[PDB]
């Protein structure tokens, strides 16, 4: 009503926004609409640094050059410890295969995520340790692309020790951007970067908020090629109308005939289930069918979709088990701060019982993971 | 190089990404965008806020067998809730000689109750959430339910919501409905809590808005600007700060004083302090104490210090805070209640046993 | 062939292998021997020759030695802790829920008969401990509170601890420490009741004795008077071999009637069930003959059954009387928290069908 | 005023009041009586007229009565569980870390001396449990594995349980059940080793017996002729400071040192403040022991047998002590400073800080210490 701002905060007011989140959402939405440029605008405004956002190799050399050899020696020693510890941890996450029942093989794998973003608030000693842990653990984890960002100091750039640590510990990209804009830049794959799948590293409450919002918190997908039995594919897609209030489902195939025949068969099958308004509604709100050219196309699609439930009804099940990388529970065949943080745990199973072994069954129940 | 042979209406990659798109769009757009998404997803050609007439007609459509069923479940939930709420009396405790700490349960201004349909589980849910929110004492209860085309909100839901105390019955579902309650669209208050089951979209748009610090000093003409300035300056020990006053004079004197105090610190402290004051602190002028307190509550600060006359009035009136320090000196009703803690006074002597006893809890 | 150039008065080999082993030894000796052996172990370990249970006079004389600055301090802390506790205890009401028409479930918080509070000494933290536990045990509503603290030779219990224990509600103040003290409360020595819960910090021996005696189910009991249908008790009793089971009755006839009926009901079970059931009946089941309803109730309570079924007249009486059990089913048809048993009861059968009321009742718990 | 129309086989009253009471009674009886009292309970409750520890003859005879289908089943279960276990065990290699320059902390998993495995009978789930537990303990590296199952009258242990136990790696198969069987493994009766761990499902009696015996800080200093009497005496006195109820041991092979330490103790109790002086004098009297051994081997053997939570070694040939000592909690070398359930995790460290390096410190601190 009245209120008169005798001061006014240059980033947490009202007449700027009401709440930390109102700001954070506003900013993320702005950056998401705008892209590289709106990110850059926020960076300029908040960080006040007019050097490049992604450090060029020369800048890295110049940064590393400013680090006393004593501090470098220290950093390599801390690095040594962390990476040795992490590779220990990583040995415990070996692939498993268990014939739970004769004829049925269940497995697990630890898969590294594509890209990790590591936020570093600055160049303090605690921050250098932070940067080492995060970049080193993410590297040993096997992430294909690691970004380290730190809010620059004006005219100074990224704290030089942060640059050194990031570099020796395995960071693919070193970024001069902080806070909400920085987090978004990694999250959204701005500036030609890949989309960070995990984002680790301490930060102030704006940074913590965008992160809870962006990375905090059941899809189903069926991969089928021309050999898939159109009856079974349509049956499965229909049974996604039991727990299918929500529950998106995708069909990824390389065969036109199959897909069109399935959209075809839906009216006959939806009809033959209380349920059968549900099912129909679900189908055209959530279900999606995608045509592919070759099998690699299907697999890459599947991966970028990272489905919670994955069924493979195609030839060469061995290939599909080898290739596919992002899923929750994979069923092959119609007849069906620590390294851990940077990894998917994926579970798969193939086959159907080719006999009966009650002792072995019960032993499996008792065992599990 | 991929082809969509069949597409789903609900074009984005992921639920969170989609939810954000809708939320951000609606936040800028207001009622009209909310309605737009209502049109698209809800597929229903009626008003969003049900009129007394619409309520009456819906009420008329529920068999008397079901009405009595709903009234009986309501009776049960109400005596149970009223029982619990009787256990939440203000307590104030002379913890150590001279320092009195207290606790209060205060009901939040507005609750949103989501009701996904008219199956018995949903009707139960609606009674549960709306009855409890009512008993807790929420000043405004919104019940919204996904409307079905031509039919509206399941008439049983209307009956339940209405008898159980809902102030607003809304024919809007999913992200648009959640947004409508959260942001105070259609003249409604901004829902502080949102309860009730929902699809994964409803749950996500809810984690964002309600899932997950700030400090304030309330001062009037009697506050001594030295203590106020020290107290605010020591906020560089990040985290926003407010000074809320009704005294034009006081405000400007403190605003004059800060850099002189910033100079008193060791050099690790001084850069941080200057930046913190620069970036996060804000000073606000109000007409009278009533004004000030209302401002304070709308800010709901984690730390609240009161440097004003008539502390008794301040303790009674102030409602939304984390910890209140008065003076320059120092499924269940619980869900709908914020627990506030206040402290008054300073140590009066030293009592080892009482202190050691306090240490535990 | 190893030589002990110095031995521990306690944790030595040839005196025992392990703390746990020593604790077992003492508890066993005390449990068999009783009062005198407890006393002898007190003599051995505390080395103090005043009364074990302080007389009222000893209490007053102990109180008199507490500087009044400290008395007032203790009184003040006690006031806060009581004022805090009564808040929580007000949160433990009696409930009643019509889960389905005709079937009413309950809960109650019941205070245990006797609670024991250990106090390891007389420092300020120890005093706070005593104030905490004795005060809470009183607010909770335990009929008998025993506080013991290890005596200091010639001195007795720390005067501050006597004052705290007394004003906070302790019914008994005991000058005994360690395993012998814990056992004295646990085993109801010296005319004291058997402590149901034991709270309070202590050395490794005290903690071990508490782990064994008070640390930590699907036992079963049926109360029947002559009205119970013998077929029904027989079925329910065998149904535990599907874990101790008791039939507690006051009508001799029923008991004998059911005993003879048992084997035919064992026979008319599938083939895996029959041997297991026969074994269980002889090995885990008991039939106990009582005088009247009263005796049965007292029996049920002393056994503290997890599952309790009442097949008698005046189900309201049993709901009123029976107060040590887990889950009560009446009829053939069917912080302060530490000091209390939570009992849940139900009566009745469906007398109707209210789908909403039922769904909401489902939520009230789940 | 009660009359017992039917009594349960030692579940009744004036037998006992309680499950816990019965278990304590039976356990106390067995600790006193030994083998013979254990046997008494066995005969009484189990009512089985054969031997307790199966001979190779009885084992092979038992094996012979198992249908070849079930043998195949069990072998398939064993093979799965074994391969899985050895995968997990490969992850448990000894690790060594220079957390700070000059300060080396390590971790290792030690297999326990003896695992006892309870098997309640011969039902399918029970066979899975037996395979599961005995195989896991075998892979873990238990030097001695005891399997016991209650014998059935005239038959003995279910031949199936004997088969699983034997192929899965069991060193001893026991025809004894319930409390008496838990007791027999736990107390090392019948010439058997004392079971350090006890795994396996069982009735209320068995579960309480194993809660009693296995449910839920001691200190030891190993010193040889080279240790500093002042250092030892101060640590032992400072073990009567914040841990004066916690037992303390001095294990040495040099009489001279020990005698000197004992003579120094009271003068050191004298030179500290009086809140301390009574507590310490008491603590030394009540909890401290000084044990003289013939040689260092006797020392390490004592140490392991005592299995101390805190262990400090003030002797020469520190590398040897690190290699030799097996059962401790935290080992401090030098005067300066799933297979899992079947294994002790021991942490050791040697050296002192021995430079600075602020980053390594900060990294070690965030690393949650240890």
PDB file of C-alpha atoms in Angstrom, chain D residues 48-234:
ATOM      1  CA  UNK D  48      16.669 -86.610  20.180  1.00  0.00           C
ATOM      2  CA  UNK D  49      18.868 -89.527  21.102  1.00  0.00           C
ATOM      3  CA  UNK D  50      21.786 -89.077  18.680  1.00  0.00           C
ATOM      4  CA  UNK D  51      25.087 -87.206  18.765  1.00  0.00           C
ATOM      5  CA  UNK D  52      25.327 -83.428  18.666  1.00  0.00           C
ATOM      6  CA  UNK D  53      28.305 -82.889  16.342  1.00  0.00           C
ATOM      7  CA  UNK D  54      27.839 -84.962  13.149  1.00  0.00           C
ATOM      8  CA  UNK D  55      30.696 -87.325  12.249  1.00  0.00           C
ATOM      9  CA  UNK D  56      31.794 -87.572   8.587  1.00  0.00           C
ATOM     10  CA  UNK D  57      29.910 -90.888   8.582  1.00  0.00           C
ATOM     11  CA  UNK D  58      26.612 -89.380   9.771  1.00  0.00           C
ATOM     12  CA  UNK D  59      27.092 -86.450   7.364  1.00  0.00           C
ATOM     13  CA  UNK D  60      27.623 -88.671   4.288  1.00  0.00           C
ATOM     14  CA  UNK D  61      24.700 -90.876   5.357  1.00  0.00           C
ATOM     15  CA  UNK D  62      22.553 -87.724   5.610  1.00  0.00           C
ATOM     16  CA  UNK D  63      23.762 -86.480   2.241  1.00  0.00           C
ATOM     17  CA  UNK D  64      22.778 -89.820   0.727  1.00  0.00           C
ATOM     18  CA  UNK D  65      19.098 -89.389   1.730  1.00  0.00           C
ATOM     19  CA  UNK D  66      18.592 -86.119  -0.233  1.00  0.00           C
ATOM     20  CA  UNK D  67      16.815 -86.500  -3.631  1.00  0.00           C
ATOM     21  CA  UNK D  68      19.162 -85.772  -6.508  1.00  0.00           C
ATOM     22  CA  UNK D  69      16.718 -83.115  -7.773  1.00  0.00           C
ATOM     23  CA  UNK D  70      17.027 -81.182  -4.509  1.00  0.00           C
ATOM     24  CA  UNK D  71      20.791 -81.682  -4.416  1.00  0.00           C
ATOM     25  CA  UNK D  72      20.900 -80.097  -7.865  1.00  0.00           C
ATOM     26  CA  UNK D  73      18.650 -77.270  -6.678  1.00  0.00           C
ATOM     27  CA  UNK D  74      20.835 -76.600  -3.680  1.00  0.00           C
ATOM     28  CA  UNK D  75      24.032 -76.707  -5.782  1.00  0.00           C
ATOM     29  CA  UNK D  76      22.506 -74.134  -8.125  1.00  0.00           C
ATOM     30  CA  UNK D  77      21.597 -71.862  -5.198  1.00  0.00           C
ATOM     31  CA  UNK D  78      25.080 -72.304  -3.690  1.00  0.00           C
ATOM     32  CA  UNK D  79      26.790 -71.478  -6.974  1.00  0.00           C
ATOM     33  CA  UNK D  80      24.801 -68.253  -7.361  1.00  0.00           C
ATOM     34  CA  UNK D  81      25.323 -67.107  -3.797  1.00  0.00           C
ATOM     35  CA  UNK D  82      29.018 -68.022  -3.887  1.00  0.00           C
ATOM     36  CA  UNK D  83      29.822 -66.087  -7.066  1.00  0.00           C
ATOM     37  CA  UNK D  84      27.843 -63.099  -5.824  1.00  0.00           C
ATOM     38  CA  UNK D  85      29.647 -63.171  -2.471  1.00  0.00           C
ATOM     39  CA  UNK D  86      33.109 -63.335  -4.037  1.00  0.00           C
ATOM     40  CA  UNK D  87      32.209 -60.325  -6.178  1.00  0.00           C
ATOM     41  CA  UNK D  88      31.333 -58.425  -3.015  1.00  0.00           C
ATOM     42  CA  UNK D  89      34.453 -59.710  -1.269  1.00  0.00           C
ATOM     43  CA  UNK D  90      36.714 -58.548  -4.093  1.00  0.00           C
ATOM     44  CA  UNK D  91      35.522 -55.027  -3.285  1.00  0.00           C
ATOM     45  CA  UNK D  92      37.058 -55.390   0.197  1.00  0.00           C
ATOM     46  CA  UNK D  93      40.774 -54.904  -0.454  1.00  0.00           C
ATOM     47  CA  UNK D  94      42.950 -53.226   2.188  1.00  0.00           C
ATOM     48  CA  UNK D  95      43.215 -49.424   1.668  1.00  0.00           C
ATOM     49  CA  UNK D  96      45.996 -47.026   2.811  1.00  0.00           C
ATOM     50  CA  UNK D  97      45.757 -43.231   2.716  1.00  0.00           C
ATOM     51  CA  UNK D  98      48.072 -40.307   3.515  1.00  0.00           C
ATOM     52  CA  UNK D  99      45.247 -37.995   4.644  1.00  0.00           C
ATOM     53  CA  UNK D 100      47.812 -35.400   5.729  1.00  0.00           C
ATOM     54  CA  UNK D 101      51.577 -35.452   4.910  1.00  0.00           C
ATOM     55  CA  UNK D 102      53.122 -37.859   7.391  1.00  0.00           C
ATOM     56  CA  UNK D 103      49.808 -39.222   8.779  1.00  0.00           C
ATOM     57  CA  UNK D 104      48.749 -42.541   7.244  1.00  0.00           C
ATOM     58  CA  UNK D 105      45.280 -43.962   8.004  1.00  0.00           C
ATOM     59  CA  UNK D 106      44.189 -47.343   6.639  1.00  0.00           C
ATOM     60  CA  UNK D 107      41.127 -49.623   6.599  1.00  0.00           C
ATOM     61  CA  UNK D 108      40.876 -53.409   6.311  1.00  0.00           C
ATOM     62  CA  UNK D 109      38.176 -56.075   6.704  1.00  0.00           C
ATOM     63  CA  UNK D 110      39.182 -59.007   8.942  1.00  0.00           C
ATOM     64  CA  UNK D 111      37.148 -62.237   8.838  1.00  0.00           C
ATOM     65  CA  UNK D 112      35.876 -63.281  12.315  1.00  0.00           C
ATOM     66  CA  UNK D 113      37.229 -66.398  13.999  1.00  0.00           C
ATOM     67  CA  UNK D 114      33.922 -68.219  14.112  1.00  0.00           C
ATOM     68  CA  UNK D 115      30.477 -67.837  12.632  1.00  0.00           C
ATOM     69  CA  UNK D 116      27.518 -69.748  14.070  1.00  0.00           C
ATOM     70  CA  UNK D 117      24.544 -70.350  11.737  1.00  0.00           C
ATOM     71  CA  UNK D 118      21.084 -71.235  13.044  1.00  0.00           C
ATOM     72  CA  UNK D 119      18.739 -73.241  10.768  1.00  0.00           C
ATOM     73  CA  UNK D 120      15.249 -73.843  12.237  1.00  0.00           C
ATOM     74  CA  UNK D 121      14.368 -76.917  10.171  1.00  0.00           C
ATOM     75  CA  UNK D 122      14.183 -78.207   6.637  1.00  0.00           C
ATOM     76  CA  UNK D 123      11.529 -76.063   4.902  1.00  0.00           C
ATOM     77  CA  UNK D 124      12.516 -74.541   1.525  1.00  0.00           C
ATOM     78  CA  UNK D 125      13.064 -71.048   2.938  1.00  0.00           C
ATOM     79  CA  UNK D 126      15.213 -72.555   5.673  1.00  0.00           C
ATOM     80  CA  UNK D 127      17.439 -74.272   3.110  1.00  0.00           C
ATOM     81  CA  UNK D 128      17.822 -70.948   1.303  1.00  0.00           C
ATOM     82  CA  UNK D 129      18.797 -69.298   4.597  1.00  0.00           C
ATOM     83  CA  UNK D 130      21.312 -72.053   5.347  1.00  0.00           C
ATOM     84  CA  UNK D 131      22.916 -71.766   1.882  1.00  0.00           C
ATOM     85  CA  UNK D 132      22.850 -68.052   1.973  1.00  0.00           C
ATOM     86  CA  UNK D 133      24.361 -67.666   5.463  1.00  0.00           C
ATOM     87  CA  UNK D 134      26.915 -70.529   5.398  1.00  0.00           C
ATOM     88  CA  UNK D 135      28.137 -69.653   1.895  1.00  0.00           C
ATOM     89  CA  UNK D 136      28.343 -65.956   2.714  1.00  0.00           C
ATOM     90  CA  UNK D 137      30.368 -66.657   5.878  1.00  0.00           C
ATOM     91  CA  UNK D 138      32.587 -69.045   3.934  1.00  0.00           C
ATOM     92  CA  UNK D 139      33.442 -66.537   1.236  1.00  0.00           C
ATOM     93  CA  UNK D 140      33.936 -63.855   3.925  1.00  0.00           C
ATOM     94  CA  UNK D 141      36.720 -66.050   5.264  1.00  0.00           C
ATOM     95  CA  UNK D 142      35.568 -67.465   8.582  1.00  0.00           C
ATOM     96  CA  UNK D 143      38.155 -69.897   9.825  1.00  0.00           C
ATOM     97  CA  UNK D 144      35.389 -71.884  11.514  1.00  0.00           C
ATOM     98  CA  UNK D 145      31.706 -72.135  10.537  1.00  0.00           C
ATOM     99  CA  UNK D 146      29.140 -73.904  12.763  1.00  0.00           C
ATOM    100  CA  UNK D 147      25.701 -74.795  11.437  1.00  0.00           C
ATOM    101  CA  UNK D 148      23.126 -76.024  13.940  1.00  0.00           C
ATOM    102  CA  UNK D 149      19.565 -77.138  13.378  1.00  0.00           C
ATOM    103  CA  UNK D 150      17.105 -78.709  15.878  1.00  0.00           C
ATOM    104  CA  UNK D 151      17.042 -82.472  15.354  1.00  0.00           C
ATOM    105  CA  UNK D 152      13.717 -84.123  14.690  1.00  0.00           C
ATOM    106  CA  UNK D 153      13.118 -87.280  16.790  1.00  0.00           C
ATOM    107  CA  UNK D 154      14.879 -90.334  15.395  1.00  0.00           C
ATOM    108  CA  UNK D 155      15.708 -88.500  12.160  1.00  0.00           C
ATOM    109  CA  UNK D 156      18.173 -85.859  13.375  1.00  0.00           C
ATOM    110  CA  UNK D 157      18.977 -82.802  11.296  1.00  0.00           C
ATOM    111  CA  UNK D 158      16.974 -82.591   8.073  1.00  0.00           C
ATOM    112  CA  UNK D 159      19.269 -84.345   5.582  1.00  0.00           C
ATOM    113  CA  UNK D 160      18.698 -81.381   3.261  1.00  0.00           C
ATOM    114  CA  UNK D 161      20.079 -78.972   5.844  1.00  0.00           C
ATOM    115  CA  UNK D 162      23.100 -81.262   6.238  1.00  0.00           C
ATOM    116  CA  UNK D 163      23.661 -81.249   2.467  1.00  0.00           C
ATOM    117  CA  UNK D 164      23.419 -77.469   2.096  1.00  0.00           C
ATOM    118  CA  UNK D 165      25.568 -76.823   5.198  1.00  0.00           C
ATOM    119  CA  UNK D 166      28.225 -79.285   4.104  1.00  0.00           C
ATOM    120  CA  UNK D 167      28.599 -78.176   0.470  1.00  0.00           C
ATOM    121  CA  UNK D 168      28.306 -74.478   1.358  1.00  0.00           C
ATOM    122  CA  UNK D 169      31.443 -74.725   3.574  1.00  0.00           C
ATOM    123  CA  UNK D 170      30.337 -75.530   7.117  1.00  0.00           C
ATOM    124  CA  UNK D 171      33.107 -76.812   9.387  1.00  0.00           C
ATOM    125  CA  UNK D 172      30.688 -78.160  12.060  1.00  0.00           C
ATOM    126  CA  UNK D 173      27.108 -79.417  11.758  1.00  0.00           C
ATOM    127  CA  UNK D 174      25.219 -79.612  15.055  1.00  0.00           C
ATOM    128  CA  UNK D 175      22.106 -81.544  16.028  1.00  0.00           C
ATOM    129  CA  UNK D 176      21.002 -79.065  18.673  1.00  0.00           C
ATOM    130  CA  UNK D 177      18.334 -76.390  18.568  1.00  0.00           C
ATOM    131  CA  UNK D 178      16.798 -73.510  20.450  1.00  0.00           C
ATOM    132  CA  UNK D 179      18.388 -71.726  23.334  1.00  0.00           C
ATOM    133  CA  UNK D 180      20.784 -74.600  24.120  1.00  0.00           C
ATOM    134  CA  UNK D 181      22.147 -74.538  20.509  1.00  0.00           C
ATOM    135  CA  UNK D 182      22.618 -70.774  20.426  1.00  0.00           C
ATOM    136  CA  UNK D 183      24.360 -71.163  23.782  1.00  0.00           C
ATOM    137  CA  UNK D 184      26.546 -74.013  22.520  1.00  0.00           C
ATOM    138  CA  UNK D 185      27.884 -71.992  19.587  1.00  0.00           C
ATOM    139  CA  UNK D 186      28.140 -68.740  21.592  1.00  0.00           C
ATOM    140  CA  UNK D 187      30.068 -70.246  24.552  1.00  0.00           C
ATOM    141  CA  UNK D 188      32.390 -72.585  22.600  1.00  0.00           C
ATOM    142  CA  UNK D 189      30.986 -75.763  24.174  1.00  0.00           C
ATOM    143  CA  UNK D 190      32.035 -79.300  23.155  1.00  0.00           C
ATOM    144  CA  UNK D 191      35.534 -78.193  22.156  1.00  0.00           C
ATOM    145  CA  UNK D 192      34.088 -75.853  19.541  1.00  0.00           C
ATOM    146  CA  UNK D 193      35.343 -72.251  19.189  1.00  0.00           C
ATOM    147  CA  UNK D 194      33.314 -69.408  20.654  1.00  0.00           C
ATOM    148  CA  UNK D 195      31.059 -68.133  17.888  1.00  0.00           C
ATOM    149  CA  UNK D 196      31.928 -64.496  17.359  1.00  0.00           C
ATOM    150  CA  UNK D 197      28.817 -63.953  15.241  1.00  0.00           C
ATOM    151  CA  UNK D 198      25.485 -65.785  15.156  1.00  0.00           C
ATOM    152  CA  UNK D 199      23.245 -65.524  12.065  1.00  0.00           C
ATOM    153  CA  UNK D 200      19.942 -67.102  11.119  1.00  0.00           C
ATOM    154  CA  UNK D 201      16.186 -66.981  11.732  1.00  0.00           C
ATOM    155  CA  UNK D 202      14.546 -68.662  14.721  1.00  0.00           C
ATOM    156  CA  UNK D 203      11.675 -68.609  17.215  1.00  0.00           C
ATOM    157  CA  UNK D 204      11.205 -66.143  20.099  1.00  0.00           C
ATOM    158  CA  UNK D 205      13.479 -68.191  22.373  1.00  0.00           C
ATOM    159  CA  UNK D 206      16.364 -68.256  19.862  1.00  0.00           C
ATOM    160  CA  UNK D 207      15.959 -64.608  18.923  1.00  0.00           C
ATOM    161  CA  UNK D 208      16.121 -63.531  22.591  1.00  0.00           C
ATOM    162  CA  UNK D 209      19.086 -65.804  23.300  1.00  0.00           C
ATOM    163  CA  UNK D 210      20.987 -64.217  20.480  1.00  0.00           C
ATOM    164  CA  UNK D 211      19.879 -60.726  21.497  1.00  0.00           C
ATOM    165  CA  UNK D 212      21.232 -61.504  24.963  1.00  0.00           C
ATOM    166  CA  UNK D 213      24.593 -62.874  23.843  1.00  0.00           C
ATOM    167  CA  UNK D 214      25.233 -60.842  20.685  1.00  0.00           C
ATOM    168  CA  UNK D 215      23.230 -57.650  21.215  1.00  0.00           C
ATOM    169  CA  UNK D 216      24.635 -54.128  21.280  1.00  0.00           C
ATOM    170  CA  UNK D 217      34.746 -48.788  24.604  1.00  0.00           C
ATOM    171  CA  UNK D 218      37.698 -50.624  26.127  1.00  0.00           C
ATOM    172  CA  UNK D 219      41.331 -49.546  25.674  1.00  0.00           C
ATOM    173  CA  UNK D 220      44.622 -51.360  25.369  1.00  0.00           C
ATOM    174  CA  UNK D 221      48.256 -50.240  25.145  1.00  0.00           C
ATOM    175  CA  UNK D 222      50.812 -52.667  23.804  1.00  0.00           C
ATOM    176  CA  UNK D 223      54.276 -51.694  25.092  1.00  0.00           C
ATOM    177  CA  UNK D 224      57.735 -53.246  24.745  1.00  0.00           C
ATOM    178  CA  UNK D 225      61.066 -52.321  26.410  1.00  0.00           C
ATOM    179  CA  UNK D 226      61.383 -49.243  24.189  1.00  0.00           C
ATOM    180  CA  UNK D 227      58.192 -47.468  25.272  1.00  0.00           C
ATOM    181  CA  UNK D 228      58.504 -44.290  27.347  1.00  0.00           C
ATOM    182  CA  UNK D 229      57.260 -44.829  30.944  1.00  0.00           C
ATOM    183  CA  UNK D 230      56.111 -41.206  31.192  1.00  0.00           C
ATOM    184  CA  UNK D 231      54.114 -41.527  27.951  1.00  0.00           C
ATOM    185  CA  UNK D 232      52.454 -44.792  29.016  1.00  0.00           C
ATOM    186  CA  UNK D 233      51.648 -43.540  32.487  1.00  0.00           C
ATOM    187  CA  UNK D 234      50.157 -40.273  31.214  1.00  0.00           C
TER     188      UNK D 234
END
